[PDB]
């Protein structure tokens, strides 16, 4: 039941992204695991910004309590933007993914915020804690996550 209603919502959100994607974003459909828990969004940097011409990929991971808990969202692939709120390994520092999260937010709204964050940025710099944070992230054994619950 929880997951039936969660699947219903997620299905409607995926239809909206395929039929009216935010500017510069596309969902990657060669990743078809019946789109019930993780999908990949191709995103291109915007003209006139520090990321003009760059092609990025966003990973969305939905837990069993979505939308009351926020999805996990990161950059992946091998082109990861250089940005003060994005780590080298692609993790993103954005509290709407944390304590400004509300269930009334959507994938669409998170996508717009990531886009707004890229083109708002005036300094192509990495986060000050980056080398620490990524060294600690390479020592944790989360390899097989059952993680959906």
């Amino acid at each position: 039941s929880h997951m039936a209603s969660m699947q219903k919502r997620l299905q409607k959100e995926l239809l909206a992204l395929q039929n009216d994607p935010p500017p510069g974003m596309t969902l990657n459909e060669k990743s078809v695991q019946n789109s019930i828990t993780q999908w990949i969004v191709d995103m291109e940097g915007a003209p006139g910004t520090l990321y003009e011409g760059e092609k990025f990929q966003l990973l969305f991971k939905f837990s069993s309590r979505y939308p009351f808990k926020s999805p996990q969202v990161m950059f992946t692939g091998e082109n990861i933007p250089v940005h003060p709120h994005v780590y080298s390994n692609g993790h993103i520092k954005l509290s709407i993914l944390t304590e400004d999260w509300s269930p009334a937010l959507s994938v669409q709204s998170v996508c717009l915020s990531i886009i707004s964050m890229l083109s708002s940025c005036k300094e192509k710099r990495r986060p000050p804690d980056n080398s620490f944070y990524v060294r600690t992230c390479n020592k944790n054994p989360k390899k097989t996550k059952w993680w959906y619950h």
Partner: protein, 80 residues
Amino acid sequence: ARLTMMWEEVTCPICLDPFVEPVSIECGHSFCQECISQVGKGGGSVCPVCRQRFLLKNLRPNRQLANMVNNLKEISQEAR
């Protein structure tokens, strides 16, 4: 011509489906009873849209919204 903007504004922002048993909280924002009670576990939390605080002590049914959603389901009931 016709437009389905109709349906968007009788959609609960949590489940993204038409409101079922809609209730209002203190701020006056409306949600499905089941969705906002999921939000307000323990007797309270903050509004998904406005973040004003609320308690489910003061849930109030939105009777105008209940009646409208029901009537629109009838108009939209179609043979397949």
